[PDB]
Amino acid sequence: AKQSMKAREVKRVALADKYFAKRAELKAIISDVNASDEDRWNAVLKLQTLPRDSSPSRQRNRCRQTGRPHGFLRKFGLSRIKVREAAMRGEIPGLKKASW
Amino acid sequence: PRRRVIGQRKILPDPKFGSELLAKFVNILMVDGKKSTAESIVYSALETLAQRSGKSELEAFEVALENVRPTVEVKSRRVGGSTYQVPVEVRPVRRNALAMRWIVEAARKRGDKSMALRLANELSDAAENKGTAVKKREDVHRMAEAN
Amino acid sequence: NQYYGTGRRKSSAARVFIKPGNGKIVINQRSLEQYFGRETARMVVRQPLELVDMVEKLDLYITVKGGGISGQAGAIRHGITRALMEYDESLRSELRKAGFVTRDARQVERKKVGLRKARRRPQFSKR
Amino acid sequence: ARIAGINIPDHKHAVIALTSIYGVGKTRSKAILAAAGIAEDVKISELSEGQIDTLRDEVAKFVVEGDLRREISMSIKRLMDLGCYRGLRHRRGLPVRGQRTKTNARTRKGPRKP
Amino acid sequence: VSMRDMLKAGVHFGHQTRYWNPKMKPFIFGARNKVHIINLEKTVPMFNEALAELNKIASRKGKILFVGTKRAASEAVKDAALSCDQFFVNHRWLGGMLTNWKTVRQSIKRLKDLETQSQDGTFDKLTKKEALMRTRELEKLENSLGGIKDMGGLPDALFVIDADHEHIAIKEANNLGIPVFAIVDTNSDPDGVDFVIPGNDDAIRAVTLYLGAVAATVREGRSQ
Amino acid sequence: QRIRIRLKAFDHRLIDQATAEIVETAKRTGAQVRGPIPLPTRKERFTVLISPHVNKDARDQYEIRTHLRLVDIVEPTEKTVDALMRLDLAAGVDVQISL
Amino acid sequence: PRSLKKGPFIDLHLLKKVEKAVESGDKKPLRTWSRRSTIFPNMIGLTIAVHNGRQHVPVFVTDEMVGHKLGEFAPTRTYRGH
Amino acid sequence: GQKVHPNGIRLGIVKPWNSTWFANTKEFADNLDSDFKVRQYLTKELAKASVSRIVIERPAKSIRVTIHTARPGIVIGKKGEDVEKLRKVVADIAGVPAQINIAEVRKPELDAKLVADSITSQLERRVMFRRAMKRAVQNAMRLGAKGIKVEVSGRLGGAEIARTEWYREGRVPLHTLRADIDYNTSEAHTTYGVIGVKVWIFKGEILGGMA
């Protein structure tokens, strides 16, 4: 897709990478029963102030090859089109035409 | 079967009586592959048939069959430029099949607060020539001569 | 002595051990009619043994894995057939013509792409 | 019988009979029955007045019939007066829980009009 | 071959007077029972003079093609060719055998490849069905080119039985200039045969006489 | 005590050669090797739309079959463990040693 | 509903703006894009201009509105029939 | 109709893969992604070395690429200075100790990648596509192949409409799986667009499976 899209995905990944511990501990506080319910409150307030793109769920798996948002295969990290080209050429090890 | 017509799976006989015609009957009554449900109703109906209508349940089977099994039907074929209602006489297997179909459909058209009672009463009326299956043998013999 | 046979149906497998001496049948540490709730299954497992007429002459210790009640019953029948064949060669000639050494190869056919089942095709619309 | 719900449950099993009260389903029916120590399969016939009075005493423990209808109507009417989204979809007779209106909203829209 | 030697075999026999060809009048003795009778007075010297040419060709290392497609006489002609180390056609004459020899060369190569391959191996590598199919192809190729697998090039002389039946072969030969030696019944057209032998072509006895005499003279021509 | 070694690969020729080499190195060093025991292969399927646009019925089905072998040595000596430690195998095979 | 263990959710900038307004007397309708904030009981008697996608429509909060989200009072789809 | 890729369908039967490492789902994606980056880099640098193929293996720790080209001198140069720079850039492009390797293809007229690349390079010169593919077929056949087929497509000779056309000679059984059919494509970026060339080369049937 457009280069700006790949750039957005790179920025989202890099950003969610550096705030992981902060998000994890804030979530731990919020979900923790036995929190003083003042701690949980300022915890949720503090959590919603982090950069929105620091959320792992904001990311969208795109083809490492072309950046295509749909038809993704987590195993290969490529869209459905590029995996076929790579497989017919013999780049994906062990992959072959299945028939049973 | 444009090249060669192929025959039918010779089905395996009834486990309770070793007869193959009751096997075809339970296959006809079966719905959605529920064979156990089917054979349960068939055995229940033949048992009470052996009581409310004299003995010989396996014989009362054909007592109803020969009472419903048709001889002539119509096979509309356009050998003259238009579908002509020409009558044709059947082999034994054709009339067997039509008999069992007509039995089961009439049984399903009864209610009788059970399918066991449905099939039982319908097969009794068929054996002694009462009901609707016998009537649809009457009509298949009637329209076979109408043209 | 001991006589076994391996029977198979669509997806079941049955090990059958024949021991002369009685007419008991044990399936997976259970009795026949207490293992199989359907009557046609009991009939089909007694099928070969009653054909060769030697029912109360030899008891059966049989295990079975996989498949459903009908597949398990058919696999048991095939195993009993092969076990009897080992016990007496003469029985095999009648067993074959009864259709017991058939080992039917029929099995569930795979689901194909673009169809809803093995052969059921989606409901096309002309108009 | 003349249960708290002024309607008359039929002469079927006690649970299926009590389900006829508006606001009493099968779960709450068997809850009523078990709490009154009355059996499950018994019908409202052969049920003594001493037992029907316990049934009434225990069904009065809930909010049923007109009182429940008034509360549901008040909640919808109040919800309509707020001017909230579901209030508008109630006023416009369109599905409020976010279903398709592009097609088959027939339970809310009624039969078809060309 | 002496006139008496032919006559006992029945060389004088011919086709019906209903079925004859116009150019054969000089070679016809007459008619009996509506049957054409061939004249041995012409037959014997012409056959001898043809044997002279065949001996000459074989004595200059000639390759000889015996030709006959009669279902009765196929094996006779094949054995006749084998008795003198020569080449033969004993089944349907393939149009283009001489004119299109090059395509036959590919067929001869395929026949050689199949027979060599089975001895060499690779049949085990093939599935049993595939190996059996290859054997069937080899058998079909042998039934088609058993006689001419070792001919190597175009033959130097042709011997033809019932020249009318094998007319394509003689047309090819004339187109190539290859000489034609042929037993010519009364119903045949003798224009295509440069050394023409008028005689019966069906009777097994006379056919075998022709073949045996030719083969004896061919071995004689080879021996020197 | 035991040393249990698992080998995963994508083709069975290579992994069988690897097992043979492993067991022969273990035989040189006087060990007792349970001959390679075949464990169930894992077929990963992937169905993928071949057409770039419009056609969803036209697909293609691929499969990675992970072949897996288990070798086990029960009487190991130092000259056993070091031998398979000085052992380099084909690139396609993954070895996993456990004690 | 989100959950009771977490308690209701309000966007922090609405918290700040609302306490500013309630502490400093009446204001003009405060402008907000936070359709996802929960209406709180201190947030009563105020008027809030919630953006419906294209324009901040003013909603005058009342007591029985507490608990609902602001976006429930700013319809985002214009429709009048066919 | 559309034909199946004549190399993918023979994978495992007669054709080997071009990447033979093993990985798990954890490191499977990024592994072949670094693999792809390696391939593209090598094909960019060796654009004049007539590189036919680039195989990658990954042993325990390192990675090892093998370059099949017909110009081993060009990738070797002098005492392997160029291949050493290649080793450096490959090792840093994969984050792993590299090991480059070369294996000369001896008949550059019998491998589908090189004949297709030659055809495309000729089509850059605006040579007649007809005689280009005809020379390709003639050379490949004369060198000893059993069959060959070439197919060019798309605005041939600067024309205004796309005229796909092909030329084959010999024997190319595309439905036989034994057949070792070397297939490869190439693109030629002309002034009038892209001209796609496909090449199939049949070099006899293989008997006895993969080995």
Place this chain on the structure above:
RNA sequence: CCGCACAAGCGGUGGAGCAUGUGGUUUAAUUCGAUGCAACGCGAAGAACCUUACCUGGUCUUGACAUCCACGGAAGUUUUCAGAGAUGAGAAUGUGCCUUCGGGAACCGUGAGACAGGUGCUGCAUGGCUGUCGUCAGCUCGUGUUGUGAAAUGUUGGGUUAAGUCCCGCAACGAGCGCAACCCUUAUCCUUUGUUGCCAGCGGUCCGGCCGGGAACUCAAAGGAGACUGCCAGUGAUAAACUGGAGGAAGGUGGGGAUGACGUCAAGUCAUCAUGGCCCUUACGACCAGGGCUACACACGUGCUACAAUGGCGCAUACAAAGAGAAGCGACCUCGCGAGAGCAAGCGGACCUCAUAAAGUGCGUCGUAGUCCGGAUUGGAGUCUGCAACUCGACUCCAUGAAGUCGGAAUCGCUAGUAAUCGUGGAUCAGAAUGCCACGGUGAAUACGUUCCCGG
């Protein structure tokens, strides 16, 4: 002369509710593409934000993304205020590495131009990829012969086959691409290896293959064997083949895949990508928040659940296969009516977890009714994912209990483990399946035939 094309059958669709796609209209925008078969659960293997391309508003101008140039700084880290956020304004800390000591790398910011950028237009400029006729049986060439020649023959005919399959005839013989086979899988057997799989004979048991042990058997997965009209009889030019029979686990290409010739449709895709030309280049590029893609008088297509006693409900209880798992699958135990929660073992997995299959079967109940059928809709109260469930999530509980009583004309699928029914799993995926792709369980009916319908 062929094909589920009809016929013979079985189950549907068309009627009802809901799911989903399209058209239409509406809208601020309802992003763009796909349009007879061969578009319409299609691209999309999964739109709350993100995605996202669309809209409203707020914003940037060598730029979000790349190379080069100077100038200044280590890079980072943490924290405050204003803002809806983009962003601005700062305040703290650190000021590092290699060095041939000059700097250099590493990045960061500012500046200037080359340029970046475009899911902008044209699939009638293209590559690549795909559909379709159609897995239909065809399409050709060489050489030969015939004709002055364009050409024809081969490839027509008689038989036969799933087949241009094969035989016979025949101036043709041959071949090539197709067909068939080689490949995968399934059905039988044998060999080798036997843990995490197995338990026949053994002893021991807490009765659990659990434990000594055993390598037999089921399995696992690598090698091989096996089916060829090979055998028999009969038809047929004796041939090809066809009909039956034997043996055999399997019989006549055993079943099912994959495999799609020459070409047709200026078929589809410039929005995967690549790409000629053109168009924008403080904007048709870039960033952000909110909204939309989910609208609804309607129309069509594809599905789901139903209308019930072959069934509903309650209790009891039996038999699978194939899969997935490390920001993962998550047992046992306690808590909750439940969705779930707490604690936390094991498992990169024939070991552990998802995960108890459902139909079935036994027993009881309901008695043909808008019902103990059906579950739509709506009110109330929750759980979980997630910055965030208003628009617009899934699920749970309590209550509510529409239409619907088997569907007009018309029309669809299917020839055997098939149809029909019953559950299970996977991909995508934080969450979000009635779709798709797979998996097993139960398991039919009918085929006189080729007159017609469609297509070839």
